[PDB]
Amino acid sequence: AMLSPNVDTALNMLTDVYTDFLGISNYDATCNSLFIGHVAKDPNWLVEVRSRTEILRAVMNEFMQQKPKIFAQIITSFINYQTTFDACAQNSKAITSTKQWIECLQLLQKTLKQNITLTNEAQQVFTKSYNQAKNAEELLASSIQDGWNELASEEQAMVRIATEIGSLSQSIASLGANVTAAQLRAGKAYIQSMVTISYGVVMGATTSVPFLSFAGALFTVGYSAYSTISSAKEVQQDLDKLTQLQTLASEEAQAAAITKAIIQTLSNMSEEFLKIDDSLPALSLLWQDELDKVNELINALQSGSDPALLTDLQTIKIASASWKTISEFVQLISLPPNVGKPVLVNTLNNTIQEQ
């Protein structure tokens, strides 16, 4: 236990930070790109969904108003500590008085308390937005449930259409790249492209018309998003079975099934990126661990322990290398990601690029 965290541990946690904040931004983009058409006077349940999705849109836009500041603070926290820590580490043990060691280590103490405070405050932003999103998603679930209850005759047809839509989304998501610290460190470049699925519905069993459009981000390496989506057999298979399943249902029941599947996807991504993949709690405990070790060392040298026998000080120049490696990483993930050309998936069964 040096004055440093385990490096592999810290990088994987920073990778989670970097995928989570990317996920939040893309989720926000998904919320603000959601489009629902008309032709066919809106049923009551769709009037309700339009309003309640708008609330969810507002909740995530409010969070985005703070996300840049929150992300910047995380990056700065690691840049500031490594710089301060590197200044301590240079102290040649030969000519560095114990009073000097105490001084520079107390500057570490000051920064760590800063870092802990700003991390906890950011975590409160997450919990505020998470609870807001959950309440909004509960209103969405009620509306679509009431809509399905107005169509009990077609309930099992709607369940099948919704399931295939969830499967189709999963089949595309399963083509995404695995983002790890090892691969970011090794220079791998991840491409972030938005994939729009345009869900049509059949009118009077005769003509397909647009109903809803929904976009989400897909990460690839090397090849574009279109290259792998257009090449996946599972995707085209899911598209063909969805078309046949939509022939068993009213235009309105088709719409209610699409809407329920999209509501479920929105709810899972908020649960994912605003709570489960929220790594701020683990970030605070990292700083806390370091404060405990620095205060123990400060207490030790103040109270008369012999400095050259305290292992935290014997290894200070190795902990500095760890912090440098960590700071090199946060600067890497601070870059703008690479945006690829978007992909359109239309449920008249075609895959287009640049669209």
Author numbering: 0 to 354
Task: Provide excerpts from the study.
The proteins MakA/B/E can form a tripartite toxin that lyses erythrocytes and is cytotoxic to cultured human cells. Here, we identify the proteins from the five V. cholerae genes, vca0880 through vca0884, that are coexpressed from the operon makDCBAE and analyze the crystal structures of MakA, MakB, and MakE. For structural analyses, MakA, MakB, and MakE were crystallized in their soluble, compact forms in which the hydrophobic β-tongue is hidden in the interface between their respective head and tail domain. Each protein is predicted to undergo a conformational change in which the head domain is unfolded and rearranged into two long helices in order to assemble into a membrane-bound tripartite complex.
MakB has the same overall fold as MakA and MakE but deviates more from MakA, with an r.m.s.d of 3.0 Å calculated on 328 Cα atoms. The MakB tail domain is very similar to that of MakA; differences are mainly found in the head domain in which MakB comprises a larger β-sheet (strand order β1β3β2β4β5) than MakA. MakB has two additional cysteines, Cys87 and Cys103, which form a disulfide bond that rigidifies the connection between the carboxyl terminus of α2 with the N terminus of α3. In MakB, the hydrophobic region constitutes most of β2 and all of β3. The pore form of AhlC was used to model MakB and generated a structure in which the tip of the protein has one more hydrophobic side and one more polar side. Next, MakB binds to the membrane-anchored MakA and arranges itself as a scaffold for the pore-like complex. We hypothesize that the first step, the conformational shift and subsequent membrane attachment of MakA, is the most critical. Both unbound and membrane-bound MakA appear to attract MakB, which would undergo a similar conformational change and interact with MakA but not directly with the membrane.
